[PDB]
Amino acid sequence: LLQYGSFCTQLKRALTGIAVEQDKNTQEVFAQVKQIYKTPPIKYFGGFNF
Amino acid sequence: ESNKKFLPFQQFGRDIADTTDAVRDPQTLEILDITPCSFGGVSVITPGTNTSNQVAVLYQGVNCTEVPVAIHADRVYSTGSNVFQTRAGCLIGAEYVNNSYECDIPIGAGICASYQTQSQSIIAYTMSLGAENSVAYSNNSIAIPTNFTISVTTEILPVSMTKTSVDCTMYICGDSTECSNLLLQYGSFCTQLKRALTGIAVEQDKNTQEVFAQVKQIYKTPPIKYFGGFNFSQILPDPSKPSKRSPIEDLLFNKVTL
Amino acid sequence: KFNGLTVLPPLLTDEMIAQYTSALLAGTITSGWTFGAGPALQIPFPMQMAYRFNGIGVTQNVLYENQKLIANQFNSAIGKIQDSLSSTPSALGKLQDVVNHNAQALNTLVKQLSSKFGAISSVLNDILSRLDPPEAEVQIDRLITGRLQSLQTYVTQQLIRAAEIRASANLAATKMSECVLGQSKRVDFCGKGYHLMS
Amino acid sequence: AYRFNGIGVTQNVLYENQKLIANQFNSAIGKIQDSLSSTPSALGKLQDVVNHNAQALNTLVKQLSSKFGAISSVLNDILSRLDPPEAEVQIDRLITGRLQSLQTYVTQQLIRAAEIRASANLAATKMSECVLGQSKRVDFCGKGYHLMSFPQSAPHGVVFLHVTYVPAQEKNFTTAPAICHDGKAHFPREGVFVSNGTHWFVTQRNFYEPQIITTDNTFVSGNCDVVIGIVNNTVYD
Ligand SMILES: *[C@@H]1O[C@H](CO)[C@@H](O[C@@H]2O[C@H](CO)[C@@H](O)[C@H](O)[C@H]2NC(C)=O)[C@H](O)[C@H]1NC(C)=O
Ligand SMILES: *[C@@H]1O[C@H](CO)[C@@H](O[C@@H]2O[C@H](CO)[C@@H](O)[C@H](O)[C@H]2NC(C)=O)[C@H](O)[C@H]1NC(C)=O
Ligand SMILES: *[C@@H]1O[C@H](CO)[C@@H](O[C@@H]2O[C@H](CO)[C@@H](O)[C@H](O)[C@H]2NC(C)=O)[C@H](O)[C@H]1NC(C)=O
Ligand SMILES: *[C@@H]1O[C@H](CO)[C@@H](O)[C@H](O)[C@H]1NC(C)=O
Ligand SMILES: *[C@@H]1O[C@H](CO)[C@@H](O)[C@H](O)[C@H]1NC(C)=O
Ligand SMILES: *[C@@H]1O[C@H](CO)[C@@H](O)[C@H](O)[C@H]1NC(C)=O
Ligand SMILES: *[C@@H]1O[C@H](CO)[C@@H](O)[C@H](O)[C@H]1NC(C)=O
Ligand SMILES: *[C@@H]1O[C@H](CO)[C@@H](O)[C@H](O)[C@H]1NC(C)=O
Ligand SMILES: *[C@@H]1O[C@H](CO)[C@@H](O)[C@H](O)[C@H]1NC(C)=O
């Protein structure tokens, strides 16, 4: 198989790029805020129920 | 050992993927399960060579109470030192701490690594999402700003790429008539390749055309640059240099090197 | 873990994503749209509801004089969602298709290993134990070639699917920015009707 | 002043803080050159195009030295050593392998071109919406309330400079939904009722500027026995 060139490097590079892209998708969708806000202990919001 | 209920006439065993996963011992009638031996990938975690020469090693998806010694295929050498077990595999050469910082080098399921001063060493930790904050909510309270800030940010976007063309005869057969005649029997692949490349080049030109040619006139700034105290000298063209480019554009063109 | 094929874990676990979602919900409940453009500023919930009605062309006294009715309607509507999702079986086909396609592709790739490609046998050990060095090459070449095209086809299909997944993720990010962190005037972008909040 | 009015702030806020705003803008525009120059990985997106093109071309030209199970990788060697009726067996393997190399290159190029076209379409939309106008879409033309943008060119790409407004230095206040007076309810026209502890004013939402409550900035439209949390005071005429 060593005589067939360098196909394996291309395959590995493609798969690695796909994986990195997969992580970046979630990173840019969900990490929209810098702080971590917390809801007040008592849940009264004028009659609305969350 | 196997708990499978083999019928008294069958000997082998198979799975959904059609592989051998059971066998019957000939001399003593018994059923044995076969499992493949451990294998995986090896990753090397390093800071820049301008900083240090230490490294850490990650064995991916392997319980490493089972691998103090194994071969590298692509040779036996072990490291010892500090061994930590994670979800993505296990880590050799790094120390686990109880703190939490911003992620620097991603590793696995919420684990990152960094080069710290503790002397300097390589440490592993769980990434921190951010700073905790709670807003004082009440049903008769409000907050109103009393000042403001003007902020300027940048955004970079690619537009086009390089246009290339390829010739079949020169690339494949060089200048051999016999090779060309032999290749003539393979059909009309070359026409398809040429058409695809030509379409790509035309698209590349159209991208820039539709991004930048948004106006019909060519407006010119007034000779005297007074705009109520605002200073646009950094983005307006500079006539002193022959290229007729703004300082920021010059910096951008210098930064990107072929 | 099937013949050189491995699956890597995602970087962000489910708990971290849940924490992100909780933070977004708390921010949009206690502040409104202010926390998406700077510091978070507190405001009572009915007052921002009045602001959101004012943003679609209805005065505030409409909200302030129908508070209980609006709250009851919202509570009933939010209650019906669990039943609506649970009853319909095909409500989550989009998320199931990803798993199905990945499993099918991996199964096809591993099943391709048993083909012969015009050779004496599909097992390398059989050829290495039956034949001799100077003749086994003719048989081995066909196997090597066929497995090579199998791998190439798999990789190309993966790239084509990844492009579509990226497009969908970009749309989801835009919707997160525009429907959740603010109020949208675009028609039929954040639901059907006049948008209030998401 | 028009652009401030477009985000909910009156014009007198600009006209009475002209020098301060100009100085802030000048400092912010000054910091950009240093910010771009210091960071080395600021322009990775534009460098990746060049890197990928060079890598693909290098791989394609390097593939020419493979043998593909032939006696030699040079056509002239086979044409000078062997004879016509036998060289075909060797030449066929080379022709085939070079054919798959070319096909793989072309397919990769098409796949990359699709992504480049998508990015160019996004850039065109941003040019139309952030530069030729003012955008109300959140987080589309920067972070904050959008004011205006400037374009700059770059090798194989474009750079946008977004200018935005950010509030600062908030403060506690007490508020009410409506004001009761003479058995009538009063609501603000634009703004919110606010109290400093003993007196009530009406103010705009994005900047603190109290005013005296008057019939010229309120409307009655109702009665005092329905609203929850109403507070009764005096309304000047
Ligand atoms: C918000 O809605 C939930 C769900 O309807 C309410 O929880 C219910 O409370 C009643 C009374 O305690 C119970 O009988 C139900 O079994 C609860 N339902 C569930 C699903 O747990 C909750 O009480 C509501 N909030 C308020 C403040 O009333
Ligand atoms: C709003 O913020 C600006 C920016 O900091 C304040 O202006 C500064 O005021 C201090 C105090 O005199 C000066 O030392 C700085 O030089 C000013 N900055 C600039 C850029 O001129 C301004 O005072 C703040 N507004 C209020 C009401 O305090
Ligand atoms: C607009 O900003 C530029 C850049 O700060 C100013 O140019 C500076 O001018 C001073 C005084 O002549 C020189 O000492 C600096 O060396 C200049 N900087 C550069 C980078 O050339 C320019 O003066 C400003 N515009 C106005 C009207 O003052
Ligand atoms: C690793 O093997 C040990 C041996 O008993 C076991 O206790 C442990 O749970 C295993 N861990 C993982 C992650 O498989
Ligand atoms: C690290 O220390 C913290 C604080 O004592 C503790 O909560 C955490 O469990 C520790 N992590 C370990 C022991 O892995
Ligand atoms: C709502 O206002 C009442 C006073 O009318 C107060 O007692 C209660 O604590 C407030 N709610 C919250 C969550 O603070
Ligand atoms: C507003 O009130 C809260 C609760 O008392 C307080 O924590 C916060 O600091 C106040 N805001 C300012 C700007 O002081
Ligand atoms: C509130 O504003 C009024 C305006 O007349 C002023 O007289 C009073 O002193 C202020 N109270 C405080 C606590 O600043
Ligand atoms: C004014 O408000 C107070 C506080 O709720 C209330 O007791 C009083 O009755 C109101 N005035 C009139 C005339 O009703």
PDB file of N, CA, C and O in Angstrom, chain C residues 39-89:
ATOM      1  N   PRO C  39     -24.436  45.918  30.193  1.00  0.00           N
ATOM      2  CA  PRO C  39     -24.784  45.478  31.546  1.00  0.00           C
ATOM      3  C   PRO C  39     -26.264  45.160  31.663  1.00  0.00           C
ATOM      4  O   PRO C  39     -27.107  45.755  30.989  1.00  0.00           O
ATOM      5  N   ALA C  40     -26.576  44.208  32.537  1.00  0.00           N
ATOM      6  CA  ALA C  40     -27.955  43.800  32.753  1.00  0.00           C
ATOM      7  C   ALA C  40     -28.635  44.749  33.730  1.00  0.00           C
ATOM      8  O   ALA C  40     -28.097  45.040  34.801  1.00  0.00           O
ATOM      9  N   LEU C  41     -29.817  45.231  33.358  1.00  0.00           N
ATOM     10  CA  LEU C  41     -30.579  46.171  34.168  1.00  0.00           C
ATOM     11  C   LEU C  41     -31.912  45.545  34.545  1.00  0.00           C
ATOM     12  O   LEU C  41     -32.652  45.079  33.675  1.00  0.00           O
ATOM     13  N   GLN C  42     -32.216  45.546  35.838  1.00  0.00           N
ATOM     14  CA  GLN C  42     -33.431  44.925  36.342  1.00  0.00           C
ATOM     15  C   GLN C  42     -34.669  45.714  35.932  1.00  0.00           C
ATOM     16  O   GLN C  42     -34.619  46.927  35.726  1.00  0.00           O
ATOM     17  N   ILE C  43     -35.791  45.008  35.826  1.00  0.00           N
ATOM     18  CA  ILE C  43     -37.084  45.615  35.519  1.00  0.00           C
ATOM     19  C   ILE C  43     -38.183  44.622  35.882  1.00  0.00           C
ATOM     20  O   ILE C  43     -38.025  43.417  35.646  1.00  0.00           O
ATOM     21  N   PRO C  44     -39.288  45.064  36.484  1.00  0.00           N
ATOM     22  CA  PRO C  44     -40.393  44.140  36.761  1.00  0.00           C
ATOM     23  C   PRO C  44     -40.955  43.535  35.484  1.00  0.00           C
ATOM     24  O   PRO C  44     -41.012  44.182  34.438  1.00  0.00           O
ATOM     25  N   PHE C  45     -41.376  42.276  35.584  1.00  0.00           N
ATOM     26  CA  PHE C  45     -41.823  41.541  34.401  1.00  0.00           C
ATOM     27  C   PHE C  45     -43.030  42.170  33.712  1.00  0.00           C
ATOM     28  O   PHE C  45     -43.006  42.298  32.473  1.00  0.00           O
ATOM     29  N   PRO C  46     -44.101  42.564  34.411  1.00  0.00           N
ATOM     30  CA  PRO C  46     -45.223  43.195  33.699  1.00  0.00           C
ATOM     31  C   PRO C  46     -44.837  44.454  32.948  1.00  0.00           C
ATOM     32  O   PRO C  46     -45.428  44.747  31.903  1.00  0.00           O
ATOM     33  N   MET C  47     -43.849  45.207  33.431  1.00  0.00           N
ATOM     34  CA  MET C  47     -43.464  46.423  32.727  1.00  0.00           C
ATOM     35  C   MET C  47     -42.757  46.110  31.413  1.00  0.00           C
ATOM     36  O   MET C  47     -42.989  46.788  30.404  1.00  0.00           O
ATOM     37  N   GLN C  48     -41.910  45.078  31.380  1.00  0.00           N
ATOM     38  CA  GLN C  48     -41.326  44.738  30.088  1.00  0.00           C
ATOM     39  C   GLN C  48     -42.356  44.088  29.178  1.00  0.00           C
ATOM     40  O   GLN C  48     -42.249  44.192  27.954  1.00  0.00           O
ATOM     41  N   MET C  49     -43.363  43.424  29.746  1.00  0.00           N
ATOM     42  CA  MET C  49     -44.450  42.935  28.906  1.00  0.00           C
ATOM     43  C   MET C  49     -45.208  44.097  28.273  1.00  0.00           C
ATOM     44  O   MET C  49     -45.618  44.026  27.107  1.00  0.00           O
ATOM     45  N   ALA C  50     -45.395  45.181  29.029  1.00  0.00           N
ATOM     46  CA  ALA C  50     -45.998  46.385  28.469  1.00  0.00           C
ATOM     47  C   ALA C  50     -45.127  46.975  27.371  1.00  0.00           C
ATOM     48  O   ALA C  50     -45.637  47.434  26.343  1.00  0.00           O
ATOM     49  N   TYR C  51     -43.810  46.977  27.574  1.00  0.00           N
ATOM     50  CA  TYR C  51     -42.904  47.437  26.525  1.00  0.00           C
ATOM     51  C   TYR C  51     -43.046  46.593  25.266  1.00  0.00           C
ATOM     52  O   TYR C  51     -43.046  47.118  24.147  1.00  0.00           O
ATOM     53  N   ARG C  52     -43.163  45.277  25.430  1.00  0.00           N
ATOM     54  CA  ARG C  52     -43.245  44.392  24.275  1.00  0.00           C
ATOM     55  C   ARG C  52     -44.570  44.555  23.538  1.00  0.00           C
ATOM     56  O   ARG C  52     -44.611  44.446  22.309  1.00  0.00           O
ATOM     57  N   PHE C  53     -45.667  44.806  24.259  1.00  0.00           N
ATOM     58  CA  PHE C  53     -46.901  45.171  23.563  1.00  0.00           C
ATOM     59  C   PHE C  53     -46.760  46.502  22.840  1.00  0.00           C
ATOM     60  O   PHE C  53     -47.248  46.657  21.717  1.00  0.00           O
ATOM     61  N   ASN C  54     -46.112  47.479  23.472  1.00  0.00           N
ATOM     62  CA  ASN C  54     -45.907  48.765  22.817  1.00  0.00           C
ATOM     63  C   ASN C  54     -45.072  48.619  21.555  1.00  0.00           C
ATOM     64  O   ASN C  54     -45.203  49.421  20.624  1.00  0.00           O
ATOM     65  N   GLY C  55     -44.212  47.605  21.505  1.00  0.00           N
ATOM     66  CA  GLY C  55     -43.364  47.399  20.348  1.00  0.00           C
ATOM     67  C   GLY C  55     -44.066  46.846  19.123  1.00  0.00           C
ATOM     68  O   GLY C  55     -43.448  46.807  18.053  1.00  0.00           O
ATOM     69  N   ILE C  56     -45.322  46.415  19.241  1.00  0.00           N
ATOM     70  CA  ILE C  56     -46.072  45.895  18.105  1.00  0.00           C
ATOM     71  C   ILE C  56     -47.272  46.765  17.761  1.00  0.00           C
ATOM     72  O   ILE C  56     -48.073  46.395  16.905  1.00  0.00           O
ATOM     73  N   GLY C  57     -47.419  47.910  18.411  1.00  0.00           N
ATOM     74  CA  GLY C  57     -48.474  48.841  18.091  1.00  0.00           C
ATOM     75  C   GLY C  57     -49.702  48.787  18.968  1.00  0.00           C
ATOM     76  O   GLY C  57     -50.785  49.158  18.504  1.00  0.00           O
ATOM     77  N   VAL C  58     -49.577  48.339  20.213  1.00  0.00           N
ATOM     78  CA  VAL C  58     -50.683  48.305  21.162  1.00  0.00           C
ATOM     79  C   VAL C  58     -50.249  49.055  22.412  1.00  0.00           C
ATOM     80  O   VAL C  58     -49.129  48.863  22.893  1.00  0.00           O
ATOM     81  N   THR C  59     -51.125  49.908  22.933  1.00  0.00           N
ATOM     82  CA  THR C  59     -50.770  50.737  24.074  1.00  0.00           C
ATOM     83  C   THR C  59     -50.647  49.891  25.342  1.00  0.00           C
ATOM     84  O   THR C  59     -51.061  48.732  25.398  1.00  0.00           O
ATOM     85  N   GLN C  60     -50.062  50.499  26.379  1.00  0.00           N
ATOM     86  CA  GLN C  60     -49.756  49.767  27.605  1.00  0.00           C
ATOM     87  C   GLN C  60     -51.000  49.474  28.432  1.00  0.00           C
ATOM     88  O   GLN C  60     -51.072  48.429  29.093  1.00  0.00           O
ATOM     89  N   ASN C  61     -51.977  50.381  28.428  1.00  0.00           N
ATOM     90  CA  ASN C  61     -53.178  50.166  29.222  1.00  0.00           C
ATOM     91  C   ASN C  61     -53.940  48.923  28.791  1.00  0.00           C
ATOM     92  O   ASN C  61     -54.746  48.404  29.569  1.00  0.00           O
ATOM     93  N   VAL C  62     -53.707  48.432  27.574  1.00  0.00           N
ATOM     94  CA  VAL C  62     -54.301  47.166  27.165  1.00  0.00           C
ATOM     95  C   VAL C  62     -53.740  46.022  27.999  1.00  0.00           C
ATOM     96  O   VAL C  62     -54.479  45.127  28.422  1.00  0.00           O
ATOM     97  N   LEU C  63     -52.429  46.024  28.241  1.00  0.00           N
ATOM     98  CA  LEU C  63     -51.843  45.010  29.110  1.00  0.00           C
ATOM     99  C   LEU C  63     -52.245  45.228  30.561  1.00  0.00           C
ATOM    100  O   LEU C  63     -52.652  44.287  31.251  1.00  0.00           O
ATOM    101  N   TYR C  64     -52.129  46.464  31.048  1.00  0.00           N
ATOM    102  CA  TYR C  64     -52.328  46.707  32.472  1.00  0.00           C
ATOM    103  C   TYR C  64     -53.760  46.457  32.920  1.00  0.00           C
ATOM    104  O   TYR C  64     -53.993  46.263  34.116  1.00  0.00           O
ATOM    105  N   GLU C  65     -54.719  46.452  32.001  1.00  0.00           N
ATOM    106  CA  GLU C  65     -56.111  46.200  32.339  1.00  0.00           C
ATOM    107  C   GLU C  65     -56.563  44.790  31.990  1.00  0.00           C
ATOM    108  O   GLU C  65     -57.741  44.471  32.169  1.00  0.00           O
ATOM    109  N   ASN C  66     -55.665  43.941  31.497  1.00  0.00           N
ATOM    110  CA  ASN C  66     -55.979  42.554  31.184  1.00  0.00           C
ATOM    111  C   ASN C  66     -54.856  41.643  31.646  1.00  0.00           C
ATOM    112  O   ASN C  66     -54.496  40.679  30.965  1.00  0.00           O
ATOM    113  N   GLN C  67     -54.283  41.938  32.813  1.00  0.00           N
ATOM    114  CA  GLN C  67     -53.103  41.210  33.266  1.00  0.00           C
ATOM    115  C   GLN C  67     -53.431  39.755  33.582  1.00  0.00           C
ATOM    116  O   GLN C  67     -52.729  38.839  33.137  1.00  0.00           O
ATOM    117  N   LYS C  68     -54.494  39.525  34.355  1.00  0.00           N
ATOM    118  CA  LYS C  68     -54.826  38.168  34.775  1.00  0.00           C
ATOM    119  C   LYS C  68     -55.218  37.294  33.592  1.00  0.00           C
ATOM    120  O   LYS C  68     -54.828  36.123  33.523  1.00  0.00           O
ATOM    121  N   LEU C  69     -55.994  37.842  32.655  1.00  0.00           N
ATOM    122  CA  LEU C  69     -56.403  37.068  31.489  1.00  0.00           C
ATOM    123  C   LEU C  69     -55.202  36.660  30.645  1.00  0.00           C
ATOM    124  O   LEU C  69     -55.104  35.509  30.200  1.00  0.00           O
ATOM    125  N   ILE C  70     -54.272  37.591  30.425  1.00  0.00           N
ATOM    126  CA  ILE C  70     -53.081  37.285  29.641  1.00  0.00           C
ATOM    127  C   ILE C  70     -52.224  36.248  30.351  1.00  0.00           C
ATOM    128  O   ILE C  70     -51.691  35.327  29.721  1.00  0.00           O
ATOM    129  N   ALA C  71     -52.078  36.377  31.671  1.00  0.00           N
ATOM    130  CA  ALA C  71     -51.303  35.394  32.421  1.00  0.00           C
ATOM    131  C   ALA C  71     -51.922  34.007  32.320  1.00  0.00           C
ATOM    132  O   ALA C  71     -51.210  33.014  32.137  1.00  0.00           O
ATOM    133  N   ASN C  72     -53.249  33.917  32.432  1.00  0.00           N
ATOM    134  CA  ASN C  72     -53.912  32.622  32.336  1.00  0.00           C
ATOM    135  C   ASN C  72     -53.751  32.015  30.948  1.00  0.00           C
ATOM    136  O   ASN C  72     -53.508  30.808  30.813  1.00  0.00           O
ATOM    137  N   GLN C  73     -53.894  32.834  29.902  1.00  0.00           N
ATOM    138  CA  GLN C  73     -53.708  32.327  28.547  1.00  0.00           C
ATOM    139  C   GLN C  73     -52.291  31.809  28.346  1.00  0.00           C
ATOM    140  O   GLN C  73     -52.089  30.735  27.764  1.00  0.00           O
ATOM    141  N   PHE C  74     -51.297  32.556  28.831  1.00  0.00           N
ATOM    142  CA  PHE C  74     -49.915  32.108  28.708  1.00  0.00           C
ATOM    143  C   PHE C  74     -49.689  30.804  29.458  1.00  0.00           C
ATOM    144  O   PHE C  74     -48.999  29.907  28.960  1.00  0.00           O
ATOM    145  N   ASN C  75     -50.252  30.684  30.663  1.00  0.00           N
ATOM    146  CA  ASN C  75     -50.065  29.466  31.443  1.00  0.00           C
ATOM    147  C   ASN C  75     -50.670  28.258  30.742  1.00  0.00           C
ATOM    148  O   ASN C  75     -50.041  27.196  30.666  1.00  0.00           O
ATOM    149  N   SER C  76     -51.883  28.400  30.206  1.00  0.00           N
ATOM    150  CA  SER C  76     -52.495  27.283  29.487  1.00  0.00           C
ATOM    151  C   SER C  76     -51.692  26.911  28.247  1.00  0.00           C
ATOM    152  O   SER C  76     -51.482  25.720  27.961  1.00  0.00           O
ATOM    153  N   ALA C  77     -51.236  27.915  27.492  1.00  0.00           N
ATOM    154  CA  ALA C  77     -50.476  27.631  26.281  1.00  0.00           C
ATOM    155  C   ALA C  77     -49.168  26.923  26.603  1.00  0.00           C
ATOM    156  O   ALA C  77     -48.775  25.985  25.901  1.00  0.00           O
ATOM    157  N   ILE C  78     -48.477  27.352  27.661  1.00  0.00           N
ATOM    158  CA  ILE C  78     -47.235  26.687  28.037  1.00  0.00           C
ATOM    159  C   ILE C  78     -47.513  25.290  28.577  1.00  0.00           C
ATOM    160  O   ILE C  78     -46.671  24.394  28.456  1.00  0.00           O
ATOM    161  N   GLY C  79     -48.683  25.076  29.179  1.00  0.00           N
ATOM    162  CA  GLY C  79     -49.024  23.743  29.647  1.00  0.00           C
ATOM    163  C   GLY C  79     -49.259  22.760  28.517  1.00  0.00           C
ATOM    164  O   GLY C  79     -48.895  21.587  28.618  1.00  0.00           O
ATOM    165  N   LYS C  80     -49.879  23.221  27.428  1.00  0.00           N
ATOM    166  CA  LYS C  80     -50.214  22.306  26.335  1.00  0.00           C
ATOM    167  C   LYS C  80     -48.991  21.776  25.586  1.00  0.00           C
ATOM    168  O   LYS C  80     -49.117  20.792  24.844  1.00  0.00           O
ATOM    169  N   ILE C  81     -47.823  22.401  25.753  1.00  0.00           N
ATOM    170  CA  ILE C  81     -46.663  22.063  24.931  1.00  0.00           C
ATOM    171  C   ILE C  81     -46.175  20.650  25.218  1.00  0.00           C
ATOM    172  O   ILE C  81     -45.806  19.911  24.298  1.00  0.00           O
ATOM    173  N   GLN C  82     -46.130  20.261  26.492  1.00  0.00           N
ATOM    174  CA  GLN C  82     -45.638  18.930  26.829  1.00  0.00           C
ATOM    175  C   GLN C  82     -46.508  17.849  26.204  1.00  0.00           C
ATOM    176  O   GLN C  82     -45.994  16.881  25.630  1.00  0.00           O
ATOM    177  N   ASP C  83     -47.829  18.005  26.296  1.00  0.00           N
ATOM    178  CA  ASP C  83     -48.732  17.040  25.679  1.00  0.00           C
ATOM    179  C   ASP C  83     -48.571  17.026  24.166  1.00  0.00           C
ATOM    180  O   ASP C  83     -48.547  15.954  23.549  1.00  0.00           O
ATOM    181  N   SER C  84     -48.453  18.205  23.551  1.00  0.00           N
ATOM    182  CA  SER C  84     -48.306  18.263  22.100  1.00  0.00           C
ATOM    183  C   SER C  84     -47.041  17.549  21.643  1.00  0.00           C
ATOM    184  O   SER C  84     -47.056  16.826  20.641  1.00  0.00           O
ATOM    185  N   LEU C  85     -45.935  17.745  22.361  1.00  0.00           N
ATOM    186  CA  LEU C  85     -44.689  17.083  21.987  1.00  0.00           C
ATOM    187  C   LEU C  85     -44.763  15.581  22.228  1.00  0.00           C
ATOM    188  O   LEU C  85     -44.313  14.791  21.391  1.00  0.00           O
ATOM    189  N   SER C  86     -45.322  15.167  23.368  1.00  0.00           N
ATOM    190  CA  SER C  86     -45.324  13.750  23.715  1.00  0.00           C
ATOM    191  C   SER C  86     -46.241  12.944  22.802  1.00  0.00           C
ATOM    192  O   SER C  86     -45.892  11.831  22.394  1.00  0.00           O
ATOM    193  N   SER C  87     -47.418  13.484  22.475  1.00  0.00           N
ATOM    194  CA  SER C  87     -48.393  12.714  21.707  1.00  0.00           C
ATOM    195  C   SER C  87     -47.885  12.412  20.303  1.00  0.00           C
ATOM    196  O   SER C  87     -47.933  11.262  19.850  1.00  0.00           O
ATOM    197  N   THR C  88     -47.397  13.424  19.602  1.00  0.00           N
ATOM    198  CA  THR C  88     -46.939  13.232  18.230  1.00  0.00           C
ATOM    199  C   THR C  88     -45.635  12.446  18.220  1.00  0.00           C
ATOM    200  O   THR C  88     -44.672  12.854  18.881  1.00  0.00           O
ATOM    201  N   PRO C  89     -45.553  11.326  17.500  1.00  0.00           N
ATOM    202  CA  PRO C  89     -44.312  10.542  17.491  1.00  0.00           C
ATOM    203  C   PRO C  89     -43.247  11.113  16.567  1.00  0.00           C
ATOM    204  O   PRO C  89     -42.051  11.016  16.857  1.00  0.00           O
TER     205      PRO C  89
END
